[PDB]
Amino acid sequence: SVYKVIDIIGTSPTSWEQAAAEAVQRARDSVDDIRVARVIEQDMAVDSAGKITYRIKLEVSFKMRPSQ
Amino acid sequence: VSVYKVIDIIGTSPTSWEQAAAEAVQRARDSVDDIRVARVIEQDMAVDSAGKITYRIKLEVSFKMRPSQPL
Amino acid sequence: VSVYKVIDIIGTSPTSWEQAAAEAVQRARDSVDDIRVARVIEQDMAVDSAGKITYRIKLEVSFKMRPSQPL
Amino acid sequence: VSVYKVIDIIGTSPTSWEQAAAEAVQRARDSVDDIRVARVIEQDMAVDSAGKITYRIKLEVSFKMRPSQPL
Amino acid sequence: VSVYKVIDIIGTSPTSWEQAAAEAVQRARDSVDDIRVARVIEQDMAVDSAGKITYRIKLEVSFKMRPSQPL
Amino acid sequence: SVYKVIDIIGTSPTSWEQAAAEAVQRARDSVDDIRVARVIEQDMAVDSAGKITYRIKLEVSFKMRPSQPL
Amino acid sequence: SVYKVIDIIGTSPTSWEQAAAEAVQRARDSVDDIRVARVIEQDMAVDSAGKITYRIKLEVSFKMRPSQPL
Amino acid sequence: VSVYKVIDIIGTSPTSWEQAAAEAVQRARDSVDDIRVARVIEQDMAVDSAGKITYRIKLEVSFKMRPSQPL
Amino acid sequence: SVYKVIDIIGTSPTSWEQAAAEAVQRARDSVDDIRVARVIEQDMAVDSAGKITYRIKLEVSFKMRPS
Amino acid sequence: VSVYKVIDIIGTSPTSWEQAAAEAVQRARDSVDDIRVARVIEQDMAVDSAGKITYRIKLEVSFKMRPSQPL
Amino acid sequence: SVYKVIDIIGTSPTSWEQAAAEAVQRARDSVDDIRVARVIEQDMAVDSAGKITYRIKLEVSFKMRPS
Amino acid sequence: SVYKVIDIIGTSPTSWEQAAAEAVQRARDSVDDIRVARVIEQDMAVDSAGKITYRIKLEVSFKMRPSQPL
Ligand SMILES: [Ca+2]
Ligand SMILES: [Ca+2]
Ligand SMILES: [Ca+2]
Ligand SMILES: [Ca+2]
Ligand SMILES: [Pt+2]
Ligand SMILES: [Pt+2]
Ligand SMILES: [Pt+2]
């Protein structure tokens, strides 16, 4: 009945959707009761060749197990 | 003499935020016939226990009120 | 008990944001009798190709929900 | 459901913002019963010339948009 | 005339945010007397070294200034 | 040098500019120091007959005199 | 298509609408496809005599044309 | 020169937002001694299919960062 | 060094990503030096046949040469 | 019953935003000894007509209400 | 009377004040009427060896001159 | 590449810059890939003697790794 909230950033060369999804799946590997991920910010990183990386910051909350 | 109402509406899709937006815009157009702009207010995802993702988006749209229509 | 609905409306005017706002409020009062305040949320101008300006203003108002009005 | 309606509503109470919010939610649930989350947008108090306080709260709620339901 | 001053004030209580607000509004009403609405701007808690909580709330109120009152 | 900041509301049946000018002139009654007023918020009161009052909240700042309260 | 966004400030002794109109016209003298100007901020400057100038900041967008720097 | 860690946590309770906030403070103090302020970030309510309400509240807390353990 | 910051809008019938990349590619035509573009706002234009245009407003910053 | 006033104040300095803030706080403390925290709200610079910069900073401070600081 | 508004970023190895001073002085090379610069955002770049650059984004306005 | 983002507060009697460098330095003890720190909030504490402590809240992000559990 008490949850930790954290922000994470996903990235992808394909889409904000895939960057988000990757980040949520990685989070689920280790905290395992994420129900909602809220989009906080979106941006793009760009290199000199013009390759774009889509980056997305998400807020996810998870039930804290009786631990520190 | 033109007064508009503004509402928020949410679309959802397994595919994308663009698809979730398009669903909500289509449903709004079935109710009113002068929507020209829909602004993105918030985006999120819902994740079910099996890890299936649904993309969700809240849009703000305005449309001209008809005389006598309720608030 | 008493519960209220809040909505956002946009008035428009070739003259002023005050006139656009008064038009929106008067239209609102044609439907509900209990509006005593209207908060300004946003203002803009639309411009056509001749340069004719329409002042536009988004207002938030609230009013009592009547039970015989479906949500 | 691919589309959800969103509305903002205000509840009031002489006793708590929690009561003001529960009343607003329960009144909305009378009309649409799949409301699962209500977000607090704004809180205030009205104070009458005797000093009597009314707690007021504005909530945003969403629910599946029905066929033939206005936006 | 009819110019108002707008100020923020914080009330505190071990019991609730509503009581902390009531304390602040009652205190303000004995100095300035035409306060009709108090808006909640921020809420927090102070926790002491023993773990006792003090709920604290920042409110915005406006009151009519006397014709000659300094700023 | 240190400046006090205050927020004030003016009102008018006619315009927000008048509402603002009224608030600003009242401020100028006890301080020759006001050079900018920022609009923070705008609304209208509407009475039962539907008469409108435009109201506007402004922020002003001015030098703190060594004997004034904050 | 791709567009440029800019903020501009108009001023007037008369009204925020006139300040805004004036800035918009100025903008339109250079580009023909401004369709909306969003109000971002309003303020007033006030001189030592208490004379008021209404000032308004607006955000406008227009199609960027080859003969146009960023 | 000291460094502090900042985290956000959410408490919940069927009773009130004050109680939801106290549950989250209690849980935080099980791990750290020196939380002294908890700022309210957001409040909402979750409503189950039976109409039962749970009050939820997101708090931001800071405390001394110790050389061990995570940023 | 000193950088200029500008806002630009890209549009696409396909996606906000395509609208953004269009806008960034065009910016890098006038100044190759852009490394990040932050999304500021997103919206859609909808015509009377219900055809959607996705639009996105980006902030970019670049080394001021001027020149 | 413990109620606090909140005010905004601005300090200025040709040297730094730190010195600007410190000047404001020191002036505030000349009147009210118990100010312990000041939050930065905004920073800017005023620039004169041959390039001299003045750093300015707006701070928010709170302190227990008292009749020598009416409001 | 009409004014142009722009955002600019300055950097410094030593302070946000100096980073700001630099951006303001660079703007003044091009325009004469700048009277206020508002701070929008502050950040720091940090290289792989731990060296810090203070960066600041300012908004400035000035009268827009003919053409 | 998935990153974690956290907020951290540095303090210093010297300046907000030095308070920021303190928090950045401390974070570098834990992770090595921090390249930018964004300022979120600034404040000061002041003691009864007028001694000031500058405080600054920074947001930083770094690639996820076992030693920095979520
Ligand atoms: Ca309560
Ligand atoms: Ca006007
Ligand atoms: Ca997409
Ligand atoms: Ca400094
Ligand atoms: Pt220790
Ligand atoms: Pt008093
Ligand atoms: Pt891990």
Please list the residues that pair with L59 across neighbouring strands. L7, L38
Compute how many other C-beta atoms are within 10 angstroms of the C-beta atom of residue A50: 12
CA-CA distance, F54 to F52, in Å (whole number)? 7
Count of C-beta atoms within a 10 Å radius of residue L38 = 16
CA atoms within 13 A on the CB side of B58: 16
The partner residues of K14 in beta bridges, in order of sequence, read none
Q: Is the separation of the CB atoms in K55 and K42 below 8 Å? A: yes
Documented resolution in Å: 1.8
Residue K42 Cα to ligand 2 middle (Å): 35
Name which of H10, H25, H55, H71 to mutate to probe chain A: the one with the most chain A Cβ atoms within 10 A of its Cβ: H10
How would DSSP label each residue in chain A? -EEEEEEEEEEESS-HHHHHHHHHHHHHHHT----EEEEEEEEEEE-TT--EEEEEEEEEEEEPPS--
C3 touches chain D (CB under 8 A): yes
β-strands F52-63, I36-46: how paired?
A: unpaired
DSSP symbols for B2-70: -EEEEEEEEEEESS-HHHHHHHHHHHHHTT-S---EEEEEEEEEEE-TT--EEEEEEEEEEEEPPTT--
In H3-71, which ranges are E strands? 3-13, 37-47, 53-64
In degrees, rounded to 5, the angle at the alpha carbon of residue F9 between the alpha carbons of residues F3 and F10 is 120
F24 vs F10: CA distance, rounded Å: 8
Neighbours of chain D (3+ CB pairs under 8 A): B, C, E, H
By what technique were these coordinates determined? Answer: X-ray
The three-point CA angle L44-L46-L48 to 5° equals 175
A35 inside 8 A of chain B by CB: yes
How far does chain H reach from its first CA to its final CA, in angstroms? 17
Query: End-to-end CA distance of chain B, in Å?
Result: 16
Residues of E in contact with D40 (CB under 8 A): none
Tokens of K61: 């306005």
Enumerate the β-bridge partners of residue B12: B56
J8, J41, J71: best to mutate for the E interface, most E CBs within 10 A: J71
Domain boundaries, chain C: 1-71
Tally C-beta pairs within 8 A across A and B.
31
F37 and G47 within 8 Å at the Cβ level: the answer is no
| Cα–Cα distance for residue pair H40/H56, rounded to 1 Å | 11
Q: Which of E45, E52, E53 to mutate to test the interface with H (most CBs of H within 10 A)?
A: E45
What would the DSSP string read from start to end of chain J? --EEEEEEEEEEESS-HHHHHHHHHHHHHHH-TT--EEEEEEEEEEE-TT--EEEEEEEEEEEE--TTS--
All residues of chain A having their beta carbon less than 8 Å from the beta carbon of residue I15 are 15
CB contact under 8 A, F2 and J27: yes
DSSP string, chain D: --EEEEEEEEEEESS-HHHHHHHHHHHHHTT-TT--EEEEEEEEEEE-TT--EEEEEEEEEEEEPPTT---
Main-chain phi, psi angles of L21, to 5 degrees: -60, -35
φ and ψ at residue G29, rounded to 5 degrees: -60, -30
Q: Which residues pair with K55 in a beta bridge?
A: K11, K43
Distance in Å, CA D20 to ligand 1 centroid: 10
Could you say which architecture CATH assigns to the domain H1-71?
2-Layer Sandwich (3.30)
Nearest alpha carbon to residue B56 among A35, E33, G1: A35
Give the residue from C28, E17, D69, H17 showing the smallest Cα distance to B9: D69
Question: Distance (Å) from the C-alpha of residue G8 to the closest C-alpha of chain K?
Answer: 5
Q: Answer yes or no: do C55 and G17 touch at CB < 8 A.
A: yes
Judge: E21–D45 Cβ closer than 8 Å, yes or no: yes
In the reported structure, the alpha carbon of residue A2 is separated from the centroid of ligand 1 by a whole-number distance in angstroms of 19
Class in CATH terms, A1-68: alpha beta
L38–chain K nearest CA distance, Å: 4
Name every chain A residue with its beta carbon within 8 A of the beta carbon of I21.
44, 52
Q: Answer for the pair A56, A44: CB distance below 8 angstroms, yes or no.
A: no
Structure tokens at L56: 């600054």
CATH class of the domain defined by F1-70: alpha beta
Radius of gyration for chain B, computed over Cα atoms and rounded to the nearest angstrom: 14
Q: CATH number for the K1-67 domain, one of 3.40.1130.10, 3.30.230.10, 3.30.1660.10, 1.20.1050.10?
A: 3.30.1660.10
Q: Which residues contact B48 (CB under 8 A, 6 or more apart)?
A: B54
Dist. CA F52–CA B9, nearest whole Å: 31
Query: CB within 8 A of E30, min separation 6: which ones?
Result: none
How do strand L52-63 and strand A36-46 relate by DSSP bridges? Answer: unpaired
Task: Say how many Å lie between the first and final Cα of chain A, rounded.
Answer: 15
